[PDB]
Design an enzyme around this catalytic site. Structure first.
Site, PDB file in Angstrom:
ATOM      1  N   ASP A  62       0.798  -1.160  -0.020  1.00 46.48           N
ATOM      2  CA  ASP A  62      -0.027  -0.116   0.155  1.00 46.48           C
ATOM      3  C   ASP A  62       0.994   1.196   0.192  1.00 46.48           C
ATOM      4  O   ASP A  62       1.187   1.761   0.910  1.00 46.48           O
ATOM      5  CB  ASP A  62      -1.095  -0.017   1.346  1.00 46.48           C
ATOM      6  CG  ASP A  62      -1.896   0.882   0.908  1.00 46.48           C
ATOM      7  OD1 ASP A  62      -1.998   1.659  -0.011  1.00 46.48           O
ATOM      8  OD2 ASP A  62      -2.800   1.143   2.029  1.00 46.48           O
ATOM      9  N   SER A 172      23.536   1.326   0.693  1.00 46.66           N
ATOM     10  CA  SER A 172      24.698   0.609   1.022  1.00 46.66           C
ATOM     11  C   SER A 172      25.819   1.689   1.534  1.00 46.66           C
ATOM     12  O   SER A 172      26.678   1.351   2.139  1.00 46.66           O
ATOM     13  CB  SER A 172      25.317  -0.203   0.127  1.00 46.66           C
ATOM     14  OG  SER A 172      25.368   0.246  -1.258  1.00 46.66           O
ATOM     15  N   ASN A 233      15.139  -5.236   2.916  1.00 43.80           N
ATOM     16  CA  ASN A 233      14.541  -5.072   1.549  1.00 43.80           C
ATOM     17  C   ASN A 233      14.864  -6.313   0.700  1.00 43.80           C
ATOM     18  O   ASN A 233      15.580  -6.894   1.273  1.00 43.80           O
ATOM     19  CB  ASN A 233      14.906  -3.586   1.180  1.00 43.80           C
ATOM     20  CG  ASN A 233      13.979  -2.862   0.322  1.00 43.80           C
ATOM     21  OD1 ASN A 233      13.497  -3.394  -0.457  1.00 43.80           O
ATOM     22  ND2 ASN A 233      13.894  -1.690   0.592  1.00 43.80           N
TER      23      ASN A 233
HETATM   24  C1  FMN Z   1       6.352  -5.112  -5.578  1.00 48.14           C
HETATM   25  C2  FMN Z   1       7.317  -4.792  -4.371  1.00 48.14           C
HETATM   26  C3  FMN Z   1       7.068  -3.290  -3.986  1.00 48.14           C
HETATM   27  C4  FMN Z   1       8.021  -2.882  -2.939  1.00 48.14           C
HETATM   28  N1  FMN Z   1       8.043  -1.438  -2.631  1.00 48.14           N
HETATM   29  C5  FMN Z   1       8.654  -1.185  -1.372  1.00 48.14           C
HETATM   30  C6  FMN Z   1       8.746   0.335  -1.070  1.00 48.14           C
HETATM   31  O1  FMN Z   1       7.918   0.744  -1.452  1.00 48.14           O
HETATM   32  N2  FMN Z   1       9.484   0.616   0.036  1.00 48.14           N
HETATM   33  C7  FMN Z   1      10.188  -0.554   0.731  1.00 48.14           C
HETATM   34  O2  FMN Z   1      10.793  -0.105   1.697  1.00 48.14           O
HETATM   35  N3  FMN Z   1      10.055  -1.936   0.447  1.00 48.14           N
HETATM   36  C8  FMN Z   1       9.490  -1.981  -0.703  1.00 48.14           C
HETATM   37  N4  FMN Z   1       9.441  -3.485  -1.232  1.00 48.14           N
HETATM   38  C9  FMN Z   1       9.930  -4.387  -0.070  1.00 48.14           C
HETATM   39  C10 FMN Z   1       9.594  -5.115   0.690  1.00 48.14           C
HETATM   40  O3  FMN Z   1       8.967  -4.289   2.015  1.00 48.14           O
HETATM   41  C11 FMN Z   1      10.254  -6.072   1.617  1.00 48.14           C
HETATM   42  O4  FMN Z   1      11.485  -5.350   2.184  1.00 48.14           O
HETATM   43  C12 FMN Z   1      11.024  -7.295   0.618  1.00 48.14           C
HETATM   44  O5  FMN Z   1      10.058  -7.475  -0.547  1.00 48.14           O
HETATM   45  C13 FMN Z   1      11.147  -8.571   1.258  1.00 48.14           C
HETATM   46  O6  FMN Z   1      10.146  -8.986   1.812  1.00 48.14           O
HETATM   47  P1  FMN Z   1       9.220 -10.479   1.179  1.00 48.14           P
HETATM   48  O7  FMN Z   1      10.118 -11.320   0.564  1.00 48.14           O
HETATM   49  O8  FMN Z   1       8.516 -10.830   2.420  1.00 48.14           O
HETATM   50  O9  FMN Z   1       8.415  -9.743   0.189  1.00 48.14           O
HETATM   51  C14 FMN Z   1       8.602  -3.692  -2.211  1.00 48.14           C
HETATM   52  C15 FMN Z   1       8.648  -5.280  -2.213  1.00 48.14           C
HETATM   53  C16 FMN Z   1       7.815  -5.588  -3.626  1.00 48.14           C
HETATM   54  C17 FMN Z   1       7.700  -7.134  -3.878  1.00 48.14           C
HETATM   55  O1  ORO Z   2       9.369   0.943  -5.540  1.00 47.68           O
HETATM   56  C1  ORO Z   2      10.236   0.221  -5.703  1.00 47.68           C
HETATM   57  O2  ORO Z   2      10.828  -0.047  -6.729  1.00 47.68           O
HETATM   58  C2  ORO Z   2      10.783  -0.517  -4.542  1.00 47.68           C
HETATM   59  C3  ORO Z   2      11.095   0.199  -3.398  1.00 47.68           C
HETATM   60  C4  ORO Z   2      11.811  -0.433  -2.301  1.00 47.68           C
HETATM   61  O3  ORO Z   2      12.239  -0.108  -1.184  1.00 47.68           O
HETATM   62  N1  ORO Z   2      12.147  -1.804  -2.431  1.00 47.68           N
HETATM   63  C5  ORO Z   2      11.999  -2.687  -3.720  1.00 47.68           C
HETATM   64  O4  ORO Z   2      12.110  -3.749  -3.629  1.00 47.68           O
HETATM   65  N2  ORO Z   2      11.215  -1.938  -4.668  1.00 47.68           N
END
Ligand code: FMN
Ligand code: ORO
Ligand code: OBR
Length: 324
Positions: A62, A172, A233
């Site tokens: 979201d 990093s 992340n």
């Molecule tokens: C489609 C997608 C969009 C994401 N956008 C963000 C973001 O806007 N900000 C953020 O901090 N992490 C973002 N993430 C990272 C997730 O918060 C999370 O750290 C990462 O996907 C690892 O967790 P998971 O394997 O359970 O999904 C995104 C991940 C996905 C898959």
């Molecule tokens: O908006 C994204 O591309 C994005 C943000 C983030 O922090 N992590 C990620 O995997 N995607």
């Protein structure tokens, strides 16, 4: 039930289309009185916040805070919205989201698509949810490098009075991190006085870190008295998807193939921080057993995202049950 029954149809659609359709249907089902999930009480106190359970929604699902009430109905102990930037921006060109189902993985290069911080705040104000809301703040892609700090400051000030905690993602290079944290921490302390309450600041790191990186980041967290650390992340690695379709797409890999790397990163920070800064374990949680494994590796809280695409909404209930 609803998601898992619809998933074969939804998986026949392109990933981002399926993603938006699923959120739209979740919203409508919620308004219809459906998609309410009972989850066990597991009160956890962390960063001075009383969490009803230790399972959160990770940022990026979201991005605009447009689905808060429907997602809260799934039983999360906390919800993180964002990443949000000062102004709206489109993100990267499509296609930019890829499903790798044989590995229970996702690759994304969304590019921080969002409606901007003013719209997020209007969305939050209009929501009924009054629980623990994290707000993840970032910079616009079109902001000059020398002015990037000020984008985080704009978002910090604008969301301060609406957030339970605020997350900033870090890259990093070491000089830039230190300068950013000095400025954001000083401003946070000023806002806490102006608003008569303290909103914790949490940093979030990627898993692709050297031992020297972990040591440096740990020193910064302690020097600036950061309130929590999200580990992690997505990864730049393609280990686990090299022989599957979309496994060479650029972006960040999540889901099952990031579980081991993200959990080891958590372990390394846990060893360095020695209990001084709470850790929030994220990456590759597809079952409750993986949430418990993060807790055993040193996490107080966890967050989920990609496991909702595969396991579905009942993963919230499973993770709370499994954690000690
Ligand atoms: C489609 C997608 C969009 C994401 N956008 C963000 C973001 O806007 N900000 C953020 O901090 N992490 C973002 N993430 C990272 C997730 O918060 C999370 O750290 C990462 O996907 C690892 O967790 P998971 O394997 O359970 O999904 C995104 C991940 C996905 C898959
Ligand atoms: O908006 C994204 O591309 C994005 C943000 C983030 O922090 N992590 C990620 O995997 N995607
Ligand atoms: C079918 C599908 C869905 C999906 N995203 C998704 C969004 C929300 C939820 S939920 F159901 F939050 F409660 F609404 F869990 C579940 C999954 N994606 C992402 C990439 N490919 C996908 N395919």
């Amino acid at each position: 039930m609803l998601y898992s029954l619809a998933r074969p149809m939804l998986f026949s659609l392109a990933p981002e289309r399926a993603h938006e359709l699923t959120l739209s249907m979740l919203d409508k089902a919620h308004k219809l009185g459906m998609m309410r999930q009972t989850v066990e009480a597991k009160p956890t106190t962390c960063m001075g916040i009383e969490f009803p359970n230790p399972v959160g929604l990770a940022a990026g699902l979201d991005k605009n805070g447009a689905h808060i009430d429907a997602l809260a109905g799934l039983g999360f102990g906390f919800i993180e919205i964002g990443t949000i930037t000062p102004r709206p921006q489109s993100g990267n060109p499509k296609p930019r989201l890829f499903r790798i189902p044989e590995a229970k993985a996702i690759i994304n290069r969304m590019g921080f698509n969002n409606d901007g911080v003013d719209k997020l705040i209007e969305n939050v104000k209009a929501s009924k949810f009054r629980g623990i809301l994290g707000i993840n703040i970032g910079k616009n892609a079109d902001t000059p490098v020398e002015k990037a700090v000020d984008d985080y400051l704009i978002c910090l000030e604008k969301v301060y009075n609406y957030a339970s905690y605020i997350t900033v993602n870090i890259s990093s290079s070491g000089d830039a991190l230190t300068e950013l944290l000095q400025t954001l921490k000083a401003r946070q302390l000023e806002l806490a006085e102006q608003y008569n309450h303290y909103v914790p600041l949490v940093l979030k790191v990627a898993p692709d870190l050297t031992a020297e990186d972990v040591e440096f980041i740990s020193a910064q967290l302690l020097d600036f008295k950061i309130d929590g650390l999200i580990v992690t992340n997505t990864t730049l690695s393609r280990e686990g998807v090299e022989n599957l379709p979309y496994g060479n797409e650029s972006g960040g890999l999540s889901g099952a193939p990031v579980f081991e790397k993200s959990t080891e990163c958590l372990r390394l920070f846990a060893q360095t921080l020695k209990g001084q800064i709470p850790l929030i374990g994220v990456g590759g949680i597809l079952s409750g057993e993986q949430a418990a494994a993060k807790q055993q590796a040193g996490a107080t809280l966890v967050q989920i995202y990609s496991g909702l695409i595969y396991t579905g909404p009942t993963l919230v209930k499973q993770c709370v049950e499994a954690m000690t």
